[PDB]
Design a protein around this ligand. Sequence first.
Ligand SMILES: *OP(=O)(O)OCC(C)(C)[C@@H](O)C(=O)NCCC(=O)NCCS
Length: 78
Amino acid sequence: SLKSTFDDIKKIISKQLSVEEDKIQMNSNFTKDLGADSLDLVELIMALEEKFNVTISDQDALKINTVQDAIDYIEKNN
Ligand SMILES: *OP(=O)(O)OCC(C)(C)[C@@H](O)C(=O)NCCC(=O)NCCS
């Protein structure tokens, strides 16, 4: 389910960024809205890779700016 991948990703983000799940929305931008720094970003991409068993290249990661970007990436790639 969209809801299922959504719920998994929110937990990952919440834990990495110390932000309550309810504050995490599709257009939430990691750096502009959720206070992510450079190490946060590295930790998040590695956490997505570990959870969803996908490989996110450096250039892909540079295009994952929001929650929706990350969900759409995972749904594209399983
Ligand atoms: O603090 P920041 O978010 O800008 O950076 C965090 C990361 C992990 C991206 C870097 O600190 C990092 O480790 N970069 C590569 C490791 C090096 O030794 N780089 C050479 C100096 S730029």
